[PDB]
Amino acid sequence: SIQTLNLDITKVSYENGAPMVTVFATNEADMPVIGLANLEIKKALQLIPEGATGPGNSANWQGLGSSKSYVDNKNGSYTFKFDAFDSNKVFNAQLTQRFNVVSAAGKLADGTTVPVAEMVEDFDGQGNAPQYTKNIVSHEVCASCHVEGEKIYHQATEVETCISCHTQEFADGRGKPHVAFSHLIHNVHNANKAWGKDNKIPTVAQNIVQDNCQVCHVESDMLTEAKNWSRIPTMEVCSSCHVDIDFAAGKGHSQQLDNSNCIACHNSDWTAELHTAKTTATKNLINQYGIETTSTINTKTKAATISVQVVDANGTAVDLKTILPKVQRLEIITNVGPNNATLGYSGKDSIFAIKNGALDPKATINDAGKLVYTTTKDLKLGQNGADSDTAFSFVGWSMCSSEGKFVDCADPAFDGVDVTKYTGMKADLAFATLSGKAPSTRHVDSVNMTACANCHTAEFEIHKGKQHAGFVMTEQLSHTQDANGKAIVGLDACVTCHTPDGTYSFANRGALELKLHKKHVEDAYGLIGGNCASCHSDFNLESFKKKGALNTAAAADKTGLYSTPITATCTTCHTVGSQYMVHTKETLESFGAVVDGTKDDATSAAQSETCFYCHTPTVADHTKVK
Ligand code: HEC
Ligand code: HEC
Ligand code: HEC
Ligand code: HEC
Ligand code: HEC
Ligand code: HEC
Ligand code: HEC
Ligand code: HEC
Ligand code: HEC
Ligand code: HEC
Ligand SMILES: [Ca+2]
Ligand SMILES: [Ca+2]
Ligand SMILES: [Ca+2]
Ligand SMILES: [Ca+2]
Ligand SMILES: [Ca+2]
């Protein structure tokens, strides 16, 4: 029943010596929550100030104990006492006092379900507001990539709880400097050294975080120590990624025996700039130029002509001739039937209209300075229902770049493997109809690029390398808004290649309905698990009525096997015959499904599935049945 448990420390009194701490618990409606059985002060701490343990040294949380002893006051308030407060006799009323309060997920007596809740609050030594803090990050940055409300590795769900246990005192006591949170946190996302008894190399963490300080260190008016990432250089933290320096021995660096002089040479401006220089320069390059793309069908030849207008940062026309020698690639992929693409991967129209400053002979720049390209593949417009009246064209492009500048592509044969030599630019999408009626467009209301950008950043150059320019997904290809009038950046353009017939092979589950699920259930399950909300605002179950067969397997002879579309969509994570699927192939067929059959059988059965008679999936609970 309870969706969110709010916790406030409303009162701290030292009038009896050891503090009495009152917590007030409210639900999402701000109603008092009575009967909490698993409330605890997980840690009582006080803040040793910046520099007190030595010149250049970090502020530290000194341990004062913990408590599970509390009275339920029957009004939403709970009052803690400490049986053994400050066992080390270090309590100092001149220091900031911190309390880390946790409520374990569980159930009240009446059976009301209660979610986990965690918080910290800081005070002075009399229970008033604090005079100074160590507020550098907030839990929210972790939720960008780790499912909110789930434990991150172990122990807790919020970074402040991690910080309250993984203290300098904790690390010193175990003779393990590396388990201090300010070392650990960088260590577990950086592949320069392994961590844990089993020496995990953080290959995946490294691939996502890419040492980008700004995914966790965010400037914030609520966090007065947010600039500590550049302002407090110490061998203890800087060594977490810089693993080959021995400061003591002067190996990899001049000898340093303490943190006294780090800041004298490692000025905040330099530390901040050097660690963010390349992502900032790339983002600046991406935002220099745009494209505006149109498509028309010649009603007699039934070929689409795509026109690309380059524009500058202010939406002002740039003649493509003026920048052609710096255009590394421009690719146009055209498919048909945006709700159920009809040409497959092999049948799609595709061209590198530009490669390393050279126009393909099939592409021209007109006197208006636009690129013009006409499809050559049969688009089969109108040959598969009303949806097949619409051709949709995905434009991806890249410009040659070195050290934050656009450069001439000096090498015609440059293969696009070295991604330091070019920038993927903003991709576009253009619709055209044979009939001259308004085009169909695919739904974009269930998943969008904002979800992707949480883990991959808004500057994600998708497929950048030898095969592709790299697609940057922006409002350039938005054709609808959400309830609040924000432009939706959909992945509808991706269907040009991620077709119901799959991609280059019938074996890859290349259909967009399957591919993102396949990739992320295999490689991102530690981050996502069953958390559909990581990509989905909702499920568009109505879209299934516009789908046909979906490619789900390759037969022995390399030909395509297909499933009815709901079965195909669910089976990506619930493989038939595996421990992840209770329904046998026979049972799925009894519910109207075709499972890895012919395209004709799957197509004929595509609207015969009874799955949604029983299954009532929501993003909150996709497992829900009658
Ligand atoms: C929109 C819903 C998303 C798109 C489009 C993509 N993702 Fe992800 N993703 C994540 C991890 C941890 C990996 C594996 C990294 C690794 O193995 O090193 C991936 C992988 C991809 C890939 C493959 C190419 C690449 O690694 O860059 C593509 C093309 C891709 N993803 C596109 C993490 C996340 C994540 C965090 C919880 C979210 C919300 C998404 N990905 C969503 C999308
Ligand atoms: C996306 C840009 C991330 C942000 C922001 C944070 N983390 Fe992360 N983390 C991320 C990835 C891709 C990985 C590798 C996961 C894997 O499956 O290998 C991790 C790893 C961790 C770990 C290690 C335990 C493990 O999952 O292997 C911990 C303890 C961890 N992350 C914690 C963490 C905290 C506390 C964050 C907020 C400060 C945080 N992460 C941000 C991706 C991202
Ligand atoms: C105490 C109440 C803890 C809280 C809260 C968190 N962690 Fe922890 N962690 C704790 C101990 C006692 C240990 C073992 C230390 C040792 O002697 O080896 C750990 C270990 C980790 C590790 C492994 C680190 C390494 O081996 O280098 C990770 C990655 C880790 N802890 C992460 C972590 C995160 C993200 C937390 C907040 C959600 C967190 N821990 C809280 C004790 C405590
Ligand atoms: C999330 C995965 C992070 C990324 C990426 C980086 N940092 Fe970080 N940093 C993070 C946390 C959760 C903490 C602990 C905050 C606390 O309250 O204890 C830190 C701490 C630092 C510090 C220490 C500051 C101090 O007062 O001693 C420094 C100097 C620091 N981080 C630097 C840093 C740099 C240079 C990064 C990019 C290369 C960077 N961090 C990434 C979480 C994350
Ligand atoms: C991992 C998250 C890191 C932490 C924590 C710190 N640094 Fe770093 N540093 C990191 C990378 C990936 C790079 C290369 C950046 C690039 O694009 O070139 C760096 C680079 C430096 C440099 C540049 C010169 C050199 O020889 O590397 C300096 C002077 C440097 N880093 C200093 C530094 C200090 C003082 C840190 C603690 C505050 C620090 N780094 C943390 C990755 C990470
Ligand atoms: C001036 C006399 C310095 C003092 C004192 C410290 N460092 Fe340093 N450091 C300095 C220079 C000129 C360089 C090379 C810069 C470059 O761009 O090449 C460095 C390098 C580092 C690095 C990065 C090493 C690498 O990437 O290979 C780190 C992490 C670093 N320094 C940290 C650091 C700390 C923590 C210090 C106090 C203990 C410290 N340095 C002192 C110049 C000076
Ligand atoms: C044709 C020019 C393509 C366009 C446009 C897009 N993708 Fe793609 N993708 C393509 C191929 C040939 C492959 C390999 C075969 C396969 O089916 O896996 C892929 C692969 C992916 C993957 C899997 C992981 C990877 O190999 O990178 C994902 C998650 C993926 N593609 C996503 C994707 C998105 C979101 C697109 C629109 C921005 C997109 N692709 C366009 C071919 C083509
Ligand atoms: C990001 C990595 C994703 C996660 C995590 C989940 N889904 Fe997804 N889903 C994703 C994409 C890119 C698409 C394709 C949209 C398109 O235009 O075809 C989908 C599609 C679905 C569908 C089809 C209906 C629709 O809304 O388009 C269903 C029924 C669906 N997804 C279910 C689903 C469930 C149950 C998940 C949690 C276990 C889940 N998805 C996670 C991307 C991602
Ligand atoms: C991967 C992105 C998934 C897609 C697509 C779908 N499901 Fe799923 N489901 C997934 C996971 C990781 C889990 C948890 C498994 C575990 O035990 O941890 C589930 C679970 C279900 C369940 C409950 C388990 C059971 O035995 O019944 C149901 C009923 C379920 N899933 C249904 C379902 C349907 C109908 C889907 C298509 C609309 C579907 N799932 C897609 C991961 C993914
Ligand atoms: C009612 C008679 C059902 C019809 C029709 C279909 N399914 Fe089902 N499904 C049903 C139940 C009662 C369960 C188990 C629920 C639980 O939580 O244990 C399921 C389970 C699934 C799952 C999860 C499988 C697993 O994790 O082992 C999936 C992916 C699933 N069902 C898909 C599905 C499809 C695609 C259907 C149409 C062909 C379909 N189900 C019909 C009940 C019923
Ligand atoms: Ca308070
Ligand atoms: Ca909280
Ligand atoms: Ca590491
Ligand atoms: Ca456009
Ligand atoms: Ca029907």
Residue numbers in the entry: 45 to 670
Give the article text.
Bacterial multiheme cytochromes (MHCs) attract much attention for their contributions to extracellular electron transfer whereby electrons are exchanged across the cell boundary and consequently between internal enzymes and external redox partners. MtrC is found on the outer surface of MR-1 cells.
The structure of wtMtrC was inspected to identify surface residues that might be changed to ncAAs with limited effect on the MtrC structure. Residue A293 in Domain II and E344 and A430 in Domain III were chosen, Figure 2C. Thus, site-specific replacement of MtrC surface residues with BocK has no discernible impact on the protein structure. Thus, our results indicate that MtrC344BocK and MtrC430BocK retain the structure and redox activity of wtMtrC. This is consistent with the ability of wtMtrC, MtrC344BocK, and MtrC430BocK to restore FMN reduction activity to ΔmtrC/omcA MR-1 cells by associating with MtrAB in the outer membrane.
